[PDB]
Amino acid sequence: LQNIIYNPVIPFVGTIPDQLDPGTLIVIRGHVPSDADRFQVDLQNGSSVKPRADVAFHFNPRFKRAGCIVCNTLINEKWGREEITYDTPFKREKSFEIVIMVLKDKFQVAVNGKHTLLYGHRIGPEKIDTLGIYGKVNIHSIGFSFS
Numbered sequence: 001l002q003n004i005i006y007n008p009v010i011p012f013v014g015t016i017p018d019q020l021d022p023g024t025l026i027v028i029r030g031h032v033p034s035d036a037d038r039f040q041v042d043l044q045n046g047s048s049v050k051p052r053a054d055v056a057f058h059f060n061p062r063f064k065r066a067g068c069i070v071c072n073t074l075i076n077e078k079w080g081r082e083e084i085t086y087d088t089p090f091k092r093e094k095s096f097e098i099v100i101m102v103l104k105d106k107f108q109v110a111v112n113g114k115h116t117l118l119y120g121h122r123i124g125p126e127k128i129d130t131l132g133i134y135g136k137v138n139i140h141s142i143g144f145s146f147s
């Protein structure tokens, strides 16, 4: 793995140091605290906050009731149609590994070595240069594998 960040402070906002061409991996290892209601990983076009940077891929584990993962895209401060995954591997008080693989037409996400979800590109992945990690989560490491 390349361009590793260890023990970043959350909220984390970081420049992705190369392009997300097909085959590129983003590998995030961390732990979910006991009081977590949600956290999110955002693949952003920049780091503007007003207007809020467009979010090509919002990957949003939620923990209330049975839990789920919500995926969506933010374009000019408007959320698109949510894509919900109900078979969620995340749990409070458990460590995890997220691997986001960039493919031509979509993201593929594996968590803890197991396929979790697909998310079709809504924004060109060439527009992505910024990794945001927010909410109730502890991140141990971030690393990339560029293709």
Ligand SMILES: CC(=O)N[C@H]1[C@H](O[C@H]2[C@@H](O)[C@@H](CO)O[C@@H](O[C@H]3[C@H](O)[C@@H](O)[C@H](O)O[C@@H]3CO)[C@@H]2O)O[C@H](CO)[C@@H](O[C@@H]2O[C@H](CO)[C@H](O)[C@H](O)[C@H]2O)[C@@H]1O
Binding pocket: 011, 040, 042, 049, 052, 053, 055, 058, 060, 070, 071, 072, 079, 082, 134, 135
């Ligand atoms: C209130 C809140 O937590 N806001 C977050 C924001 O969350 C939204 C996002 O998860 C979308 C995805 O579709 O869903 C929003 O909730 C919807 C419900 O899911 C749905 O059932 C209901 O019908 O409609 C709801 C409203 O649309 C949810 O609020 O996520 C963004 C982007 O990650 C957060 O903004 C980012 O926050 C960080 C700090 O945590 C920084 O400030 C970033 O700059 C900022 O972009 C926002 O806090």
